[PDB]
């Protein structure tokens, strides 16, 4: 990918770049999933051994406070601001807020809201004054790449994201193990209740949670499962990674062309009865200028 920016890239030292990041050593892991209930179109399989070079990855998704500093330093205008609207979950749109008649096919719970963007996540009249440490949302893939490049970083590949999110466990269902609420404790922010009609908030949150909520995984990463979907570098496909080759098994970058970029990790909206996509092997995509109230990102870096 060859992005274009209207800000210069500042000089930063290795020590500055690595703050808040964990060093993932080079090695192999078992990527992918073989859950019999996975949707075939998602291409969770095959399970395969992948070798990665050492890399750094953020412990936390990028926060509102951090994105605000980027915007203050650069004047960056996000895709949602340029388009003038973004997607908000229906239950979070205050009555009377102007909304578009737009229809996401098959997903009527998504509302296109004029004026919804990272600083006003539910549209005009909303703010992030009480959410400085929540993940920034309404950021597109382009916005994420712009932030990451300004920060001296990049987006993780899907394989880097998944190795870090798995946290040293071999083929577990979730970042922490195989049980969703071990010891009766919520470990991530997803939906409870009856999707899309009623979220009970059993895990404490019916929207985003702070980026440091819940226990970390074994590598010290927080909210890799749930909270917000996270952009990765790769173009999406369901089958590029079914090939067994060095390109798909050593530092794999995904297909060279595509239409949508990969997102990992699930969000506060995911639920077993609908998508079941908060398992660590799960994956979906979105087009790169798209934005939504449940999608953000974390950065990676070469040491």
């Amino acid at each position: 990918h060859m992005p274009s920016f209207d800000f210069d890239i500042p000089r930063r030292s290795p020590q500055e770049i690595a703050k808040g990041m964990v060093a993932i050593p080079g090695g192999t892991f078992r990527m992918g999933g073989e859950d019999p209930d996975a949707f075939p179109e998602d291409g969770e399989g095959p399970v395969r051994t992948v070798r990665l070079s050492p890399f750094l990855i953020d412990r936390y998704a990028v926060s509102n406070r951090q994105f605000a500093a980027f915007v203050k330093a650069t004047g960056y205008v996000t895709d949602a601001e340029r388009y003038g609207w973004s997607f908000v979950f229906h239950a979070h749109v205050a009555p009377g807020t102007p909304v578009m008649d737009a229809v996401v096919p098959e997903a009527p719970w998504w509302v296109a809201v004029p004026g919804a963007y990272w600083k006003a996540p539910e549209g005009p009249g909303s703010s992030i004054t009480d959410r400085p440490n929540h993940p920034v949302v309404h950021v597109s893939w382009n916005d994420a790449v712009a932030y990451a490049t300004w920060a001296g970083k990049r987006l993780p590949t899907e394989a880097e994201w998944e190795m870090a999110a798995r946290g040293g466990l071999d083929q577990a269902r979730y970042p922490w193990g195989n049980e969703l609420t071990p010891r009766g404790r919520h470990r991530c922010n997803i939906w409870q209740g009856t999707f899309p009609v009623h979220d009970t908030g059993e895990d404490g949150y019916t929207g985003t949670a702070p980026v440091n909520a819940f226990a970390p995984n074994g590598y010290g990463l927080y909210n890799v499962a749930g909270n917000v979907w996270e952009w990765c570098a790769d173009w999406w496909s369901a089958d590029w990674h079914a090939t067994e080759s060095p390109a798909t098994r050593i530092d794999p970058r995904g297909p060279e062309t595509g239409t949508a970029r990969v997102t990992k990790g699930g969000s506060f909206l995911c639920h077993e009865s609908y998508c079941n996509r908060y398992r660590v092997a799960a994956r979906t995509c979105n087009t790169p200028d798209s934005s939504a109230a449940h999608t953000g990102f974390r950065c990676a870096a070469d040491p």
Partner: peptide
């Protein structure tokens, strides 16, 4: 009925 949707795209709402 079809694959569940978690990523709502700007392109998806264009239809005439």
């Amino acid at each position: 009925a079809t694959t569940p949707l978690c990523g709502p795209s700007r392109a998806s709402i264009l239809s005439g």
